[PDB]
Amino acid sequence: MFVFLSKKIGMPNNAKIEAVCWNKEQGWIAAGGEKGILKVLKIEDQRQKDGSNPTTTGQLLVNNTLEYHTSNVYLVTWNDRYRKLTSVEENGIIVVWAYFRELQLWKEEMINDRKKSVVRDLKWSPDGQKVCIAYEDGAVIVGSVEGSPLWRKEFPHKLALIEWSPDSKMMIFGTPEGEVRVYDSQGMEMQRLKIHCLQKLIDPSKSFSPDLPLAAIDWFPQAKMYTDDTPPGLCIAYQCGRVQLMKNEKDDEPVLIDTMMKIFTVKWNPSGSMFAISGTQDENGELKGVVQFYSNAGHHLKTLRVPGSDRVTGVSWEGSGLRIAMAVNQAIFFANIKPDHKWAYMSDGTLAFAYQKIDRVEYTIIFWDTINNKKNLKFVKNLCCLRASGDLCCIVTELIGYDLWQIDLCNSIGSPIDSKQINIYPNAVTMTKTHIIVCSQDHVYAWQYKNQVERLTTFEQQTGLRRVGREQAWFIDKENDSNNQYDKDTYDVEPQSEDVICTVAANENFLLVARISGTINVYTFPHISLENKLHIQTRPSQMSLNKDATRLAIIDHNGNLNILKITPQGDELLPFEKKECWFVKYSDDIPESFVFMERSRMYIVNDQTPEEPIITEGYICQYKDFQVKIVYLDDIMKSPDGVLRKEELTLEIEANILKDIKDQLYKKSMQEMFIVIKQHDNDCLWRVYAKKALEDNDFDSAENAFVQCKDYASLKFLQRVRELDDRERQRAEIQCYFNKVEEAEEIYNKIERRDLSIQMRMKLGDWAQVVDQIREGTGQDVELQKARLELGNYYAE
Amino acid sequence: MKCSELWTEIIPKNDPNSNITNQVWSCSFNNDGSILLACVGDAILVYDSFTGNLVNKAIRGGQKEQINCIKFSKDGKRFATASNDKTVWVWSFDVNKNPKLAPEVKYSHTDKVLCLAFNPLTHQIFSGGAQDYALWTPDQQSIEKSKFKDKIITCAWSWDGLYLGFGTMGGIIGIRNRALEQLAEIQRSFPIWCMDWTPITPDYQNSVLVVGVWEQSIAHYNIQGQQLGSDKKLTYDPIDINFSTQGEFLLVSGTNNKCTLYTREGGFLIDVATKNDWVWNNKLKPVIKEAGSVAVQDQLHVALTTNDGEISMFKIQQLTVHALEGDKYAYRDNLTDIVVQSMSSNQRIRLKCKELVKNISIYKDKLAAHLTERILIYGTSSEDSQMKYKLHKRIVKKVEAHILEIVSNHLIACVKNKVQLYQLSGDLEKEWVFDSRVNCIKIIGGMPNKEGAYVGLKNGQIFKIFVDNSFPIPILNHNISIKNIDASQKRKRLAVVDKNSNLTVYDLSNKEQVFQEMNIVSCAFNNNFDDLLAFSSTDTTFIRCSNHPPLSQKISGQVVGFKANKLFVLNDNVMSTIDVSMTQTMIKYLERKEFQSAYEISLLGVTDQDFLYLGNEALIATQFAI
Amino acid sequence: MAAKGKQGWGFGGKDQNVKIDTSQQDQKKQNIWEQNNEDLIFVPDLTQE
């Protein structure tokens, strides 16, 4: 997952912005100002058509100001069920708006205001039918959507924070002194929470009421609260210190997270996967506005720092969770997020996509064929890792209760083959053509599943011992020599090392293991033995290996990119700069050319010479010969009715070399084409040249191209072709030779002489089409009977 | 299904001419389950749940009278000991500290103490004896004592921590709040002994009071005091009541010296043990479930305390019953549930029932559920890819049989040494009597009302049965008993397994032992080629063809089914599919030049490279059709 | 411009409760891969004793 910056909305009238609310269904972001400046507006689309917008959008669709106020506003909330928008001021004036179908006109539909009182926090029910209003005095008023007051109770203790349960049946209140109380929907006290987060800061004698004010309490909706086996979903944070995370209101084994930052706002994901905490951090020596992202377990995935040395106030997520809005001083910064989005792409065209369920515990894997448009679905409980090969995919899952991880292989359809179980935590997994290597914090495990040339090492019979298909597992600091076959109970994991590993890379005959301290270890596949020890100043993050094992790309944790030349016991850093890089992929055919993706911009680089950037909002699947394939996974997630088309999601971008080659082919003649193509001498270029030559009814150029390509079958094809009389049978046989038969049938039909088409169809082996053609066509009995017998045999087999 | 004793400790120190006795009254159990407590006259005993031994020596002299009740605090840190010395002690507990147990706070009522209870949330103590009831809060360290008109017998706090329920021997049951006010009062005519609160559940999310009266009845009461109207009757007077975690089971003890298990609705499942004396207190072992953990959780643990002075431990293991015919796998989930799973999309379909299911048999687009004294059948809409189950018919007749099968328009039940044929209406149709117990039966396809079947006896003779013939046809004879049988696709051979895990292959045309194998757990025939045999031992599965060396895989699991280019492996209660390569058999068939069988094998979904290979050799060896 | 300008929720003295139009309701359509969550359909048993 990565985060970066985007368009920056300017100040309305040079006024402080402190409250921003983003709608979830239709995008209507609302921001409050200083002198009663409320502005609701539409935001630009992240992606348009299949390319960059010539107008670049740049149009605020609504951008209308709804002042009505002389004082400041600091509470603006959107009702998701309806069009209502609630906003209050410092004078205790609660104003609710609604949308009328006119020229972007909003008029007040609730004007209430209680004098001699101060509003602290209003809240709306998850169902959108209840509103809770509270004051510093202690009075709590709960109302419906219609206007009939449910109850207006009075509480002795002062209140600071209000929270609603997902089922809207119970209430969470927080006092300014700092404590959490649970009440019923009828204002009846149930109990008081106990806090374990604040250690060494609270009074040792009494812990229920410390002197630390509460920053933010957030309960993630759509989450179960009458169960104990679920990831945590309720978070309570204090003004500066630890944040405490619960799976339930009655839980007594907390999850603790410590951050050195002044917590002010914590917001959950629309899907509940991650949550963001905004505020000011003094670790840099002064005040810096930062937003930190944490997982449901809590791992500090990323930290976003704004360029301004100021405070970040208020965070809102988009409906899909792909963009975030922060109100920083006098501007509304928009941060773009690319999540992990576990996906795998095979060489056969099948794409495997992992989708997380609302249960946050179970996953669905989707196998979509990019050619036949076939869709297959499987349900996998737990997912740790997903990887792909030319024709196989590896799935790494976790079994809870046995502290074990299962790795299994699946074909294009997804049938499991040779599933194995390991007791090693999959910190970083990779898998090459003939091996699968998973690395924990301190252990390394390798498994061979293919034979030396091309076989499956699972169904073998010869001598007793294990020759091919053996599993190895060793330690990183010591035990360089590869060990023998391990077991799920014999092998030991307890020993730990001071230098942990971060990233692993694999090749056909080489293996690279990185270290956090900056050391890279090289291993050989025939017999695992360390050879070299490369040194890097910064810890690598992604890492990528070139074909033939000549160079490699190092991506630092901060996003910096550089090129390292691997040499025996040496270190050569090629100067390439290009900081803040995100994705890097070396070509599997060209030893030099590669593609790197930086801040929604792609670059094709060869011989340290970059080209022009292209705006792209997709992920790179593969870089084949002068071609790069991208797939828009966001559109896949947002499918309306259940049809996926290869012409809308999948896009292919050609290199400048291929574009120029096609350019010069299409305007210039044939001989200079041959002369300029002899230097490159590539299989794809020869293939395209031969296709162009044969399309123009030229055989000398076509036979020359096939001779240069060293293809005997195509030469036999052309030799068979050249003995033809008419000008149309050659076209039909060529076009049915390529991949396609329907146009050949049509050209037979327009040429007539149908028995030729019948013979072509019967030799091609398709019998149903032959039966359909024969029926009511000629009425000859013998070939109809023979075709029906053949079709019956085909169905029986 | 099976109940096994684990460890028994007896306390024979009966003391005549002394009010101290050898009886045991209560057995407190820890939430984690690593420690157990018991109370005897003038002593408290500490035990380990897994193995029976005293981790700490018996404590004597702390209380000068008997101990009435012992309870934890749902966190494994406190004990509450109430004695006939008109005093209640609360002790602090922690396994790691050098003093494992030590008294913390002692208080006293005016009269003897009879019952005690704890608060799940706030850890407050409510102790009720004769003429008095007291509440203790750890923070304030100030007890609140109140007088009452007759001796409370039992107390129980709700799982929400808000309500409290108490009962009196005079027939009065009272429900109060944390402030101890008369929220609800109900008057009965019989003494009140056992009460409990139903555990919170996301499906139910409502708490009711379950109280067992001495007039042979069990009653459910709401918060307001209005009865739910169940009033289920019992043969014996209940004594103790305990709910399992998540509110799935109910352990009932009392008269008849039997400890029985029930569903929360009231359906009898099994009886745990019969001691031949009154069981004063029986407790269940709570379980802790991880976030998204996968486990069958068939194991159950119960602890019983009797009147003579025996504290016994029992383990309950649930057997696995399942059915697999084609494209479907219907297995019994946690008791009184049926889950149908498809191997392709891994999707599950759940059917919930109230009584215990005994056998599950699935025919073509038809599933049969055998509830206690009830039979259900569900059909399937074939046109839709997803299945839709509708109850076409229901059978009320009570039938007892360890094996049940359903065929087109008929049912077969195996009981003892007899096989009974039942019509769908319910009336018995035909009977078959054999010498010994019918161990395994296999059903083979055929016309309606004419489906044949194979039967194995404890003697070992294998017989054939036809529906209308009414005369068994002796197929063959085996000296050892028969456990599982299988039939080939063409019905050419038959694989049979004995009690010694011995597999034997018999040819039907000529009765001879062609193949014999040792240490075999399961076996299966192919349904397309008729020749492949896949047999799984405890750790290794072997696939054998005609006159071919076996193929080893070292795959963990047991083989249940074999389909074209597919083997089914079942581990515990989950199932998986694994593909096989037919390249080895194809090569071996090419070795001896039987291209027809090689092509038939390659037709099972082999890679195109082997297809072009086989085509090459077919062209070389002058076989143009193949 | 305060089209209505009425106090609600029992904030003022004289009862001036007002009516909100609740006709236009906006709902979220569940995702298709999210709509495959209901493969595990619950089927009750016919309990007619």
**HSE-CB for B226 with a 13 A CA cutoff:** 2
**HSE-CB for A790 with a 13 A CA cutoff:** 16
Q: Write the DSSP assignment of B211-224 as a string of letters.
A: EEETTTEEEEE-SS
Q: Measured between alpha carbons, how far is B354 from B337 in angstroms, rounded to an integer?
A: 8
Q: Could you tell me which CATH number the domain at B2-317 has?
A: 2.130.10.10
Q: Write the DSSP assignment of A234-297 as a string of letters.
A: EEEEESSSEEEEESSTT--S-EEEE-SSEEEEEEE-SSSSEEEEEEEE-TTSS-EEEEEEEESS
- Residue pair A166/A159 in contact by the 8 Å Cβ criterion: no
Put residue B214 in one of left, alpha, beta given phi > 0 → left and psi -120 to 50 → alpha.
alpha
Reading the block at residue A509, the tokens are 């005959």
Which of A23, A93, A101, A109 best probes binding to C when mutated, by most C CB atoms within 10 angstroms? A109
Reading the block at residue A221, the tokens are 């909706």
Q: Is the CB of C33 less than 8 angstroms away from the CB of A146?
A: no
Q: Is the CB of B294 less than 8 angstroms away from the CB of A190?
A: no
Torsion on CA atoms A675, A676, A681, A685, rounded to nearest 10? -110
Q: Is the CB of A226 less than 8 angstroms away from the CB of B202?
A: yes
DSSP state of B356: P
- Residue pair C18/C11 in contact by the 8 Å Cβ criterion: no
Q: Measured between alpha carbons, how far is A217 from A317 in angstroms, rounded to an integer?
A: 17
**A107 min Cα distance to partner chain C (Å):** 7
- Residue pair B303/B341 in contact by the 8 Å Cβ criterion: no
Q: Measured between alpha carbons, how far is A505 from A446 in angstroms, rounded to an integer?
A: 12
- CA angle, residues B431, B435, B441, in degrees to nearest 5: 65
Contacts (Cβ under 8 Å, ≥6 apart) of A789 = none
- Residue pair A89/A69 in contact by the 8 Å Cβ criterion: yes
Q: Measured between alpha carbons, how far is B379 from B217 in angstroms, rounded to an integer?
A: 39
**Option in C1, C20, C26 nearest A146 (CB):** C20
Q: Tokens 């990831």 identify what position?
A: A231
**HSE-CB for B249 with a 13 A CA cutoff:** 24
Measured over the CA atoms of residue A564, residue A565, residue A567 and residue A571, the dihedral's sign is negative
**A118 min Cα distance to partner chain C (Å):** 14
**A70 min Cα distance to partner chain B (Å):** 48
Residues of C with Cβ-Cβ distance to A272 under 8 angstroms? none
Q: What is the edge-to-edge ordering of all strands in the sheet holding A29-32? A: A19-21, A29-32, A38-41, A64-65
Q: Write the DSSP assignment of A64-117 as a string of letters.
A: EE----SS-EEEEEE-SSSS-EEEEETT-BEEEEEEETTTTEEEEEE--B-SS-
Contacts (Cβ under 8 Å, ≥6 apart) of A406 = A396, A397, A398, A399, A419, A420, A421, A422
**B343 min Cα distance to partner chain A (Å):** 10
Reading the block at residue B6, the tokens are 């684990």
Reading the block at residue A95, the tokens are 């104003």
- Residue pair B158/B121 in contact by the 8 Å Cβ criterion: no
Give yes or no for C42 touching B (CB within 8 A): yes
Residues of A with Cβ-Cβ distance to B578 under 8 angstroms? 415-419
Q: Which of B96, B109, B5, B89 is nearest to B39 (CA)?
A: B89
**A277 min Cα distance to partner chain B (Å):** 25
Q: What is the edge-to-edge ordering of all strands in the sheet holding B566-571? A: B558-563, B566-571, B574-578
Q: Pick the residue from chain C with its C-alpha nearest to A117.
A: C11
Q: Tokens 């060209």 identify what position?
A: A590
B413 DSSP β-pair partners: B404, B420
Instruction: Indicate the burial class of A215 (C-beta count within 10 angstroms; 0-12, 13-18, 19 or more).
Output: buried
Q: Is the CB of A108 less than 8 angstroms away from the CB of C4?
A: yes
Q: Phi and psi for A501 in degrees, rounded to 5?
A: -100, 155
Contacts (Cβ under 8 Å, ≥6 apart) of B90 = B78, B79, B80, B81, B103, B104, B105, B106, B125, B136
Residues from A contacting B (CB-CB < 8 Å) are 190-191, 224, 226-231, 247, 250, 252, 361, 377-382, 399-401, 411, 415-419, 421, 456, 458-459, 461, 797
DSSP state of C35: G
Taking each helix axis as running N to C, give the angle between helix A729-738 and helix A754-764, from 0 to 180 degrees, rounded to the nearest 10.
Answer: 20
DSSP state of A556: B
Q: Phi and psi for B577 in degrees, rounded to 5?
A: -115, 135
Q: Tokens 């899907």 identify what position?
A: A271
Residues of A with Cβ-Cβ distance to B204 under 8 angstroms? none
Q: Measured between alpha carbons, how far is A396 from A387 in angstroms, rounded to an integer?
A: 9
**Option in A80, A111, A146 nearest C2 (CB):** A111
- Residue pair B283/B267 in contact by the 8 Å Cβ criterion: no
Residues of A with Cβ-Cβ distance to B295 under 8 angstroms? 401
Q: Measured between alpha carbons, how far is A1 from A670 in angstroms, rounded to an integer?
A: 49
Reading the block at residue A746, the tokens are 């049509």
Q: Is the CB of A147 less than 8 angstroms away from the CB of C39?
A: no
Q: Pick the residue from chain C with its C-alpha nearest to B349.
A: C40
How much is the CA Rg of chain C, to the nearest whole Å? Answer: 23
Give yes or no for C46 touching B (CB within 8 A): yes
- Residue pair B368/B406 in contact by the 8 Å Cβ criterion: yes
Measured over the CA atoms of residue B216, residue B217, residue B218 and residue B219, the dihedral's sign is negative
**Option in B200, B347, B579 nearest A417 (CB):** B579
> First CA to last CA across chain A, in angstroms?
50
Residues of B with Cβ-Cβ distance to A399 under 8 angstroms? 294
- Residue pair A176/A158 in contact by the 8 Å Cβ criterion: yes
> First CA to last CA across chain C, in angstroms?
66
**C34 min Cα distance to partner chain B (Å):** 14
Length of chain A: 797
Q: Measured between alpha carbons, how far is B207 from B212 in angstroms, rounded to an integer?
A: 16
Q: Phi and psi for A68 in degrees, rounded to 5?
A: 55, 0
Which of C1, C4, C11, C21 best probes binding to A when mutated, by most A CB atoms within 10 angstroms? C11
Q: Measured between alpha carbons, how far is B238 from A5 in angstroms, rounded to an integer?
A: 70
**HSE-CB for A470 with a 13 A CA cutoff:** 16
Q: Tokens 């017989």 identify what position?
A: B463
Q: Where are the beta strands (DSSP E) in B256-373?
A: 258-263, 268-274, 279-284, 300-306, 310-317, 322-324, 329-332, 337-341, 348-352, 357-363, 366-371
Reading the block at residue A515, the tokens are 């270290």
Which of A181, A191, A375 best probes binding to B when mutated, by most B CB atoms within 10 angstroms? A191
Secondary structure (3-state) at B612: helix
Reading the block at residue B477, the tokens are 């004879």
Taking each helix axis as running N to C, give the angle between helix A670-680 and helix A656-667, from 0 to 180 degrees, rounded to the nearest 10.
Answer: 160
Q: Is the CB of C39 less than 8 angstroms away from the CB of B352?
A: no
Reading the block at residue A538, the tokens are 């910064």
Q: Is the CB of C39 less than 8 angstroms away from the CB of B350?
A: no
> First CA to last CA across chain B, in angstroms?
56
Helix (H), strand (E), coil (C) string for C2-32: CCCCCCCCCCCCCCCCCCCCCCCCCCCCCCC
**C31 min Cα distance to partner chain B (Å):** 18
Please report all neighbours of B, defined by 3+ CB atom pairs within 8 A: A, C
Q: Tokens 């196989």 identify what position?
A: A392
Q: Tokens 């089927």 identify what position?
A: C43
Q: Measured between alpha carbons, how far is A196 from A243 in angstroms, rounded to an integer?
A: 10
Q: What is the edge-to-edge ordering of all strands in the sheet holding B551-552? A: B522-525, B533-536, B541-544, B551-552
Query: Per-residue b/e over A782-797, b at no fewer than 16 CB within 10 Å?
Result: eebeebeeeeeeeeee
Other CB atoms within a 10 A radius of the CB of residue B185 amount to: 11
- Residue pair A456/A411 in contact by the 8 Å Cβ criterion: no
Give the A:B interface size as CB pairs under 8 Å. Answer: 76
Measured over the CA atoms of residue B367, residue B368, residue B371 and residue B374, the dihedral's sign is positive
Q: Which of A243, A248, A176 is nearest to A212 (CA)?
A: A176
Q: Measured between alpha carbons, how far is A294 from A245 in angstroms, rounded to an integer?
A: 11
Other CB atoms within a 10 A radius of the CB of residue A443 amount to: 23
Instruction: Indicate the burial class of A528 (C-beta count within 10 angstroms; 0-12, 13-18, 19 or more).
Output: middle
Which of A419, A467, A487, A793 best probes binding to B when mutated, by most B CB atoms within 10 angstroms? A419
**C38 min Cα distance to partner chain B (Å):** 9
Contacts (Cβ under 8 Å, ≥6 apart) of A177 = A158, A209, A210, A211, A213
Q: Measured between alpha carbons, how far is B185 from B223 in angstroms, rounded to an integer?
A: 10
Give yes or no for A116 touching C (CB within 8 A): no
- Residue pair A384/A399 in contact by the 8 Å Cβ criterion: no
Q: Is the CB of A459 less than 8 angstroms away from the CB of B584?
A: yes
**HSE-CB for A438 with a 13 A CA cutoff:** 23
A670 DSSP β-pair partners: none
Taking each helix axis as running N to C, give the angle between helix A712-721 and helix A729-738, from 0 to 180 degrees, rounded to the nearest 10.
Answer: 160
Secondary structure (3-state) at A667: helix
What are the C-alpha distances in Å from B183 to residues A600, B179, B399, B568? 66, 10, 48, 59
Contacts (Cβ under 8 Å, ≥6 apart) of B436 = B417, B457, B458, B459
What are the C-alpha distances in Å from A308 to residues A11, A32, A335? 15, 20, 14
Residues within 8 A of C (CB atoms), A 616-675 only: 637-639, 641-642
Q: Is the CB of A416 less than 8 angstroms away from the CB of B345?
A: no
Q: Measured between alpha carbons, how far is B436 from B458 in angstroms, rounded to an integer?
A: 6
Put residue A569 in one of left, alpha, beta given phi > 0 → left and psi -120 to 50 → alpha.
left
Q: Phi and psi for A789 in degrees, rounded to 5?
A: -65, -45
Q: Tokens 């070292």 identify what position?
A: B554
Q: Measured between alpha carbons, how far is B216 from B228 in angstroms, rounded to an integer?
A: 17
Secondary structure (3-state) at A125: coil
How much is the CA Rg of chain A, to the nearest whole Å? Answer: 33
How do strand A416-422 and strand A428-431 relate by DSSP bridges?
A: unpaired
Q: Measured between alpha carbons, how far is A190 from A135 in angstroms, rounded to an integer?
A: 21
Q: Where are the beta strands (DSSP E) in A11-65?
A: 19-21, 29-32, 38-41, 64-65
B574 DSSP β-pair partners: B571
Secondary structure (3-state) at A788: helix
B566 DSSP β-pair partners: B563
Q: Measured between alpha carbons, how far is A491 from A484 in angstroms, rounded to an integer?
A: 10
Q: Is the CB of A190 less than 8 angstroms away from the CB of B162?
A: yes
Taking every pair of Cα atoms in chain B, the longest distance, rounded to a whole number of angstroms, is 108
How much is the CA Rg of chain B, to the nearest whole Å? Answer: 32
- Residue pair A149/C16 in contact by the 8 Å Cβ criterion: no
Q: Measured between alpha carbons, how far is A245 from B590 in angstroms, rounded to an integer?
A: 65
Reading the block at residue B247, the tokens are 């509110």
Q: What residue type is assigned to position B39 of the chain?
A: C
Instruction: Indicate the burial class of A643 (C-beta count within 10 angstroms; 0-12, 13-18, 19 or more).
Output: exposed
How do strand A312-317 and strand A323-328 relate by DSSP bridges?
A: antiparallel
**Option in B160, B292, B549 nearest A229 (CB):** B292
Give yes or no for A699 touching C (CB within 8 A): no
Residues of B with Cβ-Cβ distance to A421 under 8 angstroms? 556
**Option in B347, B348, B353 nearest C45 (CB):** B353
Q: Is the CB of A229 less than 8 angstroms away from the CB of B75?
A: no
Q: Is the CB of C3 less than 8 angstroms away from the CB of A98?
A: no
Q: Is the CB of B352 less than 8 angstroms away from the CB of C44?
A: yes
Give yes or no for C39 touching B (CB within 8 A): yes
DSSP state of B590: H
Q: Measured between alpha carbons, how far is B126 from A742 in angstroms, rounded to an integer?
A: 87
Put residue A717 in one of left, alpha, beta given phi > 0 → left and psi -120 to 50 → alpha.
alpha
What are the C-alpha distances in Å from B248 to residues B201, B210, B263, B266, B334? 10, 14, 7, 11, 9
B498 DSSP β-pair partners: none
- Residue pair A635/A649 in contact by the 8 Å Cβ criterion: yes
Give yes or no for C44 touching B (CB within 8 A): yes
Q: Measured between alpha carbons, how far is B430 from B451 in angstroms, rounded to an integer?
A: 14
Query: Per-residue b/e over A617-641, b at no fewer than 16 CB within 10 Å?
Result: bbbbbbbebbebbbbbbbebbeeee
- Residue pair A80/A58 in contact by the 8 Å Cβ criterion: no
Q: Measured between alpha carbons, how far is B341 from A381 in angstroms, rounded to an integer?
A: 14
Specify the resolution in Å: 4.7
Which of A146, A366, A644 best probes binding to C when mutated, by most C CB atoms within 10 angstroms? A146
Give yes or no for A141 touching C (CB within 8 A): yes
Instruction: Indicate the burial class of B252 (C-beta count within 10 angstroms; 0-12, 13-18, 19 or more).
Output: buried
Q: Is the CB of B578 less than 8 angstroms away from the CB of A417?
A: yes
**HSE-CB for A500 with a 13 A CA cutoff:** 6
